[PDB]
């Protein structure tokens, strides 16, 4: 593997996608990088709202497993055949790897109009793979077949393309220190949030509220999704801290835009260090969570029915190291996360964890 060749290998607020060549001869697809799922799933049939798809009949090396997979959720669905084929990633590798592949033949609201990508690369753990955890994940195939370490890292530069470095850490994608937080459970990239701070003022909440259901790092979620109680506290704190006349109720919930930066507060998320007595904060400036769409803006944070999702809103500010080998998630500030000659994110530490509980994940 060549880590320098993986710099700028993603194309981008509708997702970051990697060019992947599938089958014999190779068919070029554009595949969404998703750290919150574990299946390699692509478009199989000729569907509306997409340019191209993976035709299994054109691949001589394709082999069907003889079974289907179905994923159920509230706002849609997708069904596909499970098979096996050779895959290469041009920007990073120069040899093919045998992987599992789901080919989507029917789906509800999956492929949206005006989206460039036509599949998803699930980079989370075997636990989440469908129909079961025995279906070898793409990254597990890659680690084993490509002789790379069990580590990848991701940088998103949309707010400033991006980079998915498969096998390690590229030193040119960051400056300063990498801070590591432990992976509490290996399914999603679940990490422990200790505190949320708005304009230097902590939310007066139990730290279990941040990890109610789970707190995860997900490149396949657009916004910073917060549980309803945490979301209402953040909105109240941002509204109070903001100098201006109040934002509308519709702005907070995402129904309407705000049209027209020192007037808006910083938002910091404290994460436990590998030493449990210490923590570090990942901080986003207003430029990351008041997102351009008279210039009109949308609120980059949304309410969640279940989990606290550290989505693209936050990941845009940081080079994120998914160190599966050492059971930890690294964070460093992205040099590309810069607008109008000003850094739109910060990282700092250490901070004490003496006031907070030893385990903020409920059990």
């Amino acid at each position, epitope marked *: 593997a060549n880590f320098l060749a993986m710099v700028d290998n993603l194309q981008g607020g509708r997702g970051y996608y990697l060019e992947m060549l599938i089958g014999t001869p190779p068919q070029k697809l554009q595949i969404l990088v998703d750290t919150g799922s574990s299946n390699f799933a692509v478009a199989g049939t000729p569907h509306s709202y997409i340019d191209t798809y993976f035709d299994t009949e054109r691949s001589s*090396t394709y*082999r069907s*497993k*003889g*079974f289907d997979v179905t994923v159920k959720y509230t706002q849609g669905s997708w069904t596909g055949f499970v098979g*096996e084929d*050779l895959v290469t990633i041009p920007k990073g590798f120069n040899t*093919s*790897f*045998l*992987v*599992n592949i789901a080919t989507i033949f029917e789906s509800e609201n999956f492929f949206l109009p005006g989206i460039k990508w036509n599949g998803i690369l699930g980079l989370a*753990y*075997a636990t989440l*793979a469908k129909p079961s*955890s*025995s*279906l*070898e*994940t793409f990254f*597990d*195939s890659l680690v*084993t*077949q*490509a*002789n790379i370490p069990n580590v990848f890292s991701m940088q998103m530069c949309g707010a400033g393309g991006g980079s998915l470095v498969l096998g390690g850490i590229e030193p040119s994608l960051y400056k300063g220190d990498i801070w590591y937080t432990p992976i509490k459970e290996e399914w999603y990239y679940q990490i422990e949030i200790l505190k949320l701070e708005i304009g230097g003022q902590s939310l007066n909440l139990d730290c279990r509220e941040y990890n109610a259901d789970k707190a995860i790092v997900d490149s396949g979620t657009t916004l910073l999704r917060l549980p309803q109680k945490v979301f209402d506290a953040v909105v109240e704190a941002v509204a109070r801290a903001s100098l201006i006349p109040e934002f509308s109720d519709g702005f907070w919930t995402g129904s309407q835009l705000a049209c027209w930066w020192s007037y808006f507060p910083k938002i910091s998320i404290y994460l436990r260090d590998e030493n449990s007595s210490r923590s570090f904060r990942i901080t986003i400036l207003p430029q990351l969570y008041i997102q351009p769409m008279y210039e009109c803006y949308r609120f980059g944070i949304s309410p969640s029915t279940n989990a606290l999702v550290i989505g693209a809103t936050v990941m845009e500010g940081f080079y994120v190291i998914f160190d599966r080998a050492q059971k930890r998630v690294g964070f460093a500030a992205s040099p590309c996360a810069e607008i109008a000659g000003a850094a739109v994110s910060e990282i700092s530490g250490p901070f004490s964890t003496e006031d907070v509980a030893s385990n903020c994940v409920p059990a």
Partner: nanobody, 111 residues
Framework: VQLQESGGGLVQPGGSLRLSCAAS????????MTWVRQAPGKGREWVST????????TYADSVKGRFTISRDNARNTLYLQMNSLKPEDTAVYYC?????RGPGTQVTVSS
């Protein structure tokens, strides 16, 4: 996903072994199977991968022409036929599938 390797041993240069790996606790007939090797003080090295039906096989350039991967889905067994062995082939050979691995079998080649 339970895996247990066997068939390794001490051989001469130009020798031969036939590794096996018994599988249980999962649908072996639907699983991609891969042999990996690891020697002390050396990097982890992929040997060969075989698809679930056995028709698609891939090999590392270091073993191409000399080693052959195969499987018996009816018997839940993966194989590696090893020919023309040399001292550089000395390692623990283990089978892996879906992020799990077996403890492996020692292959030693020496004069």
């Amino acid at each position: 996903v339970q895996l247990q390797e066997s068939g390794g041993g001490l051989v001469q240069p130009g020798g031969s072994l036939r590794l096996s790996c018994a599988a249980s606790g999962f649908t072996f007939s639907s699983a991609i199977m891969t042999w990996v090797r690891q020697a002390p003080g050396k990097g982890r090295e992929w040997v060969s991968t075989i698809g679930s039906d056995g028709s698609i096989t891939t090999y590392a350039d270091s073993v191409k022409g000399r080693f052959t991967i195969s499987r018996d889905n009816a018997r839940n067994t993966l194989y590696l036929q090893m020919n023309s062995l040399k001292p550089e082939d000395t390692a623990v050979y283990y089978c892996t599938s879906a992020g799990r691995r077996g403890p492996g079998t020692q292959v030693t080649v020496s004069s």
